[PDB]
Amino acid sequence: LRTQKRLAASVLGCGEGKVWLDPNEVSEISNANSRQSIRKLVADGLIIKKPVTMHSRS
Amino acid sequence: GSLAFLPRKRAARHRGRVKSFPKDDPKKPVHLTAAMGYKAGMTTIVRDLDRPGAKAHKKEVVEAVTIIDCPPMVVVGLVGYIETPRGLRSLTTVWAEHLSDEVKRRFYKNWYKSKKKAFTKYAKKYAENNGASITRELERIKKYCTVVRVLAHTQIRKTPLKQKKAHLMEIQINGGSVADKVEFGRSLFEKPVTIDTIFEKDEMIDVIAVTKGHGFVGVTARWGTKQWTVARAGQMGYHHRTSVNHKIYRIGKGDDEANASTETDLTKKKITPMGGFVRYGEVNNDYVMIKGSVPGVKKRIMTLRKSLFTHTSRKALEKVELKWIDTSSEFGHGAFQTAAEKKQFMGTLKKDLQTS
Amino acid sequence: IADVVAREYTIHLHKRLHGVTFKKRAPRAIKEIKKFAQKAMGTSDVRLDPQLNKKVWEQGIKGVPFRIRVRISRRRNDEEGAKEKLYSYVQAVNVKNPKGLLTSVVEEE
RNA sequence: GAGACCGAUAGCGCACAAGUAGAGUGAUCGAAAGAUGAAAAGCACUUUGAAAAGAGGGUUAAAUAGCACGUGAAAUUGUUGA
RNA sequence: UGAGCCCGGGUCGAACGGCCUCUAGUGCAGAUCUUGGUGGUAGUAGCAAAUACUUCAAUGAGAACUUGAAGGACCGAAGUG
RNA sequence: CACUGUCCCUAUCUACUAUCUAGCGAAACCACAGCCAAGGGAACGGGCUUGGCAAAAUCAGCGGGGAAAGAA
RNA sequence: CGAAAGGGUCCUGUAAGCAGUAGAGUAGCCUUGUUGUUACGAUCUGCUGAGGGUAAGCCCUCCUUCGCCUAGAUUUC
């Protein structure tokens, strides 16, 4: 799923370290080969962008 | 190093052999000449010295002593020997009935799956005719042999070792006609022999064992430097050594329950250190207190035998009086001899109050 | 006596990780746990929980706890033509203190 | 058009997709490499193996001619026999 | 006598030999010979530094070094961007 | 003037190796070979003489041998 | 036989938390304080020779608990 990790980074506008793929839906991610098929799985919740790491200034 | 111990190789057998029994004369009383024991560890004693001419005469000296655990050997056999131009030859070995499973473990390398059939037919010749094969073989020893030996083995259940295989050794009978020592050997069958009867207090004895092994080392520690004579690397340790003139300071009974008690300290305690001997356990049998260092590691079988010659020193004719025996912890800087006077010194603890 | 049995054990890793190189203690503790369940259940097929791997690596690579307390569950490997017919699954359990606790069988019912 | 020439380490460096491949910044330097069978008839089909391949079966006069292909030495190697 | 000559047995498939003369790029153990091939050494020397890997699942005939997730480390904007 | 393993006098601890396994895998060098002693005129043996001897196949260390001036 | 546990023996040095105006000090209330109050508060003391570790090459086990065991391959007169 390296292609899906790279394309999700471009679709979600983040790095590959913030792209999260569903461990239980690897068969569904694998069929997604277009930027529209990944945009499906972002909306459905199977590909999720992680937030920024905590950087407490206090 | 010494060229006398030149073949610096590992010892051929773990037990180690006597290689020389004392020279025998028939005018002496009948007695055995060697025994076996297990190395427990060492302690500290105070002896009230009586050495006329010494600077420590009639003073207190602190000495290091070695404890060897000695369960009573069981006599199971009798081996006769004849003189030959080629040397000395074994002519006849006579065993007894009811051989224990411990010595039977010695004749097997896999006891757990064997059928344990050793000496099964030998048990049948004691009741075959009337014992004709047994009596014939003893009469062969009486009329042909020049010196006879006794097969005795130790018991491992009395000792705190995970081993179960007994150690079987030949012990020479000295002092009598060949007829007299044979009647000793047959009468001594199936019978435990204590170390109280073999040896005695205030006696130099000869200690035989295999030393501590160190594996492959270089010339820095194998020879002691800054063909055979050239210092070369190899095996150090696990060598057979015979040590000479070690005094028996005490022979404990094991029943007495005041083994470490002297006439001057009246504390009812045993020889076992407070917390146990490190890597050995507890000594619950007869023990021999040997002055000084003694070869072999802890748990190793020790072979003790009589001195070959009459002694030429006043150190052998010295009566040993002990003032106190250390019983404190070998496992650290122990300042307490018994459990009772540690709680007396410490006072009440938190766990003692919650339990009571 | 049953093929399916779950028991809870305490592993004294302090005596199993004594003197080991500091940078191999957390990897070796995983192998010693696998060696523990292989001996205690007779099964060469041993699987460790990912959260058990979290407990071992909690204090870094050289900070393995002295005593961990786990549950080893022998279950039947059905599969299809499996090499071995049984496997053991090991999970860390939640206790106040992994000391003073005897080995015990846990009832599924 | 010929030869008392040479016959694939020989004869031109080149009997072959040879002044090629390759080397050097460049001037330049510069190889190795021919042959199943009369005819591809170059293993249909079956079986084992993930595959490569192997075993049956088949083609041929010859698979002791399997495109690692005419004949197939020695060095060196394996198995069996003494 | 010898350099050698001749026959038997197996392999192979297209040309070859005796005799008298003629002719020559005509006979090898060496040349630290030329080209090509093959050994012992030898399953031997050895397969570095950049601290560091681990668990479950998927794919696959086969997974330490292929992927997903989760732990443990790192570059630290003069970057391993 | 002070300290220090420089030494008396040396011991101990850690990492990578050295060791073993799986996979991968060279080169130097190579007439044939490798136990000693005495003798072998040419101060030259390893092959000869005549003695000591002498028993398969192997695994690790070493620091000896299988190496060396040339004569005005 | 093995894994835990309990007790012993050693090593370190008094755990987390709770409580006492002992407590230097920092601050709000109303008014004179000759004995004014109210909160926070380093530090100290007690629970506490406590707490942690303990064989990996320490010792023992009275039903201390749980588990395992007559395996299976080769070779031999």
From TrEMBL, chain A:
Specify the protein name.
Ribosomal protein L19
| Family named by the database record | Belongs to the eukaryotic ribosomal protein eL19 family. Belongs to the GCN1 family.
TrEMBL record, chain B:
Any GO CC annotation of this UniProt entry: cytosolic large ribosomal subunit
Q: Does the keyword Transit peptide apply?
A: no
A Gene Ontology biological process noted in the UniProt record is:
translation
What does the UniProt keyword field contain?
Answer: Metal-binding, Ribonucleoprotein, Ribosomal protein
Q: Is Ribosomal protein one of the keywords?
A: yes
Q: Which domain of life is it from?
A: Eukaryota
Give one GO molecular function term. Answer: structural constituent of ribosome
InterPro entries linked to this entry:
L3_arc_euk (IPR045077), Ribosomal_L3_dom_3_arc_sf (IPR044892), Ribosomal_uL3 (IPR000597), Ribosomal_uL3_CS (IPR019926), Transl_B-barrel_sf (IPR009000)
Query: Which residues take part in binding Mg(2+) 3?
Result: E330
Kindly give the SUPFAM superfamilies that the UniProt entry links to this protein: Translation proteins
Record's family?
Answer: Belongs to the universal ribosomal protein uL3 family.
Protein name per the record: Large ribosomal subunit protein uL3
Q: Which organism is it from?
A: Chaetomium thermophilum (strain DSM 1495 / CBS 144.50 / IMI 039719) (Thermochaetoides thermophila)
UniProtKB/TrEMBL annotation, chain C:
Family assignment from sequence similarity: Belongs to the eukaryotic ribosomal protein eL31 family.
Is Ribosomal protein one of the keywords UniProt gives this record? yes
Q: Which UniProt keywords apply?
A: Ribonucleoprotein, Ribosomal protein
Q: Which organism is it from?
A: Chaetomium thermophilum (strain DSM 1495 / CBS 144.50 / IMI 039719) (Thermochaetoides thermophila)
Keyword Ribosomal protein (UniProt): yes
Q: Which CDD domains match?
A: Ribosomal_L31e
Name of the protein this chain belongs to: Putative 60S ribosomal protein
Q: Which SUPFAM superfamilies match?
A: Ribosomal protein L31e
Tell me the domain of life: Eukaryota
**Which NCBIfam families does the entry link to?**
PRK01192.1-1
- What are this entry's molecular-function GO terms? structural constituent of ribosome
An individual GO BP term? cytoplasmic translation
Q: Name one GO cellular component term.
A: cytosolic large ribosomal subunit
The record ties this protein, via SMART domains, to: Ribosomal_L31e (SM01380)
Q: Which InterPro entries match?
A: Ribosomal_eL31, Ribosomal_eL31_CS, Ribosomal_eL31_dom_sf
